[PDB]
Ligand binder design. Structure first.
Ligand code: HEM
Length: 146
């Protein structure tokens, strides 16, 4: 888990992003697809489609919303190793079943700080807190088998 201090920094940086959940959630998915094209292929709903096609899809909101909803939960419980344990396990288990592994998360981790900064400058230390949180997710994926 993250420390209380680290967790607070992540929460602080996330707030402005989550303020506009719908628009920001869609934008995150789109930025992911643009920077890491192969990522779309894992999605039944977006495999083979171009970014323009994805943007125009009535399914985008459903997928993006579920992701943001869960990320918010990770941010909220990040400082509680216990809650994290369960969340991580479950998260990893679910992802692996879909064929998603740690490599994909390594990509999310690389682009995340930049995405946040595009909404509002994050406080000092927030970047390192996100990397640590993603690190925890990456570790979980590896234990889950991928
Ligand atoms: C930023 C971190 C992400 C979070 C918090 C997240 C969260 C979730 C959640 C909560 C679900 C289940 C939705 C439901 O059916 O209720 C889901 C499904 C799924 N996720 Fe993730 N995910 C993340 C990143 C990724 C990445 C990087 C990929 C692929 C590269 C991915 C691929 C999938 C796939 C294929 C499904 C199956 C649902 C479907 O596509 O119909 N996720 N995700």
């Amino acid at each position: 888990s993250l420390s209380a201090a680290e967790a607070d920094l992540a929460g602080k940086s996330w707030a402005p992003v989550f303020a506009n959940k719908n628009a920001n959630g869609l934008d995150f998915l789109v930025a992911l697809f643009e920077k890491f094209p192969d990522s779309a292929n894992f999605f039944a709903d977006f495999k083979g489609k171009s970014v323009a096609d994805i943007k125009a899809s009535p399914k985008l909101r459903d997928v993006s919303s579920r992701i943001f909803t869960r990320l918010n939960e990770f941010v909220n419980n990040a400082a509680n190793a216990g809650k994290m344990s369960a969340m991580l396990s479950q998260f990893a288990k679910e992802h692996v079943g879909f064929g998603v592994g740690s490599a994909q998360f390594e990509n999310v981790r690389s682009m995340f700080p930049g995405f946040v900064a595009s909404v509002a400058a994050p406080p000092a230390g927030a970047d390192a807190a996100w990397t640590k949180l993603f690190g925890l997710i990456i570790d979980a994926l590896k234990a889950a088998g991928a």
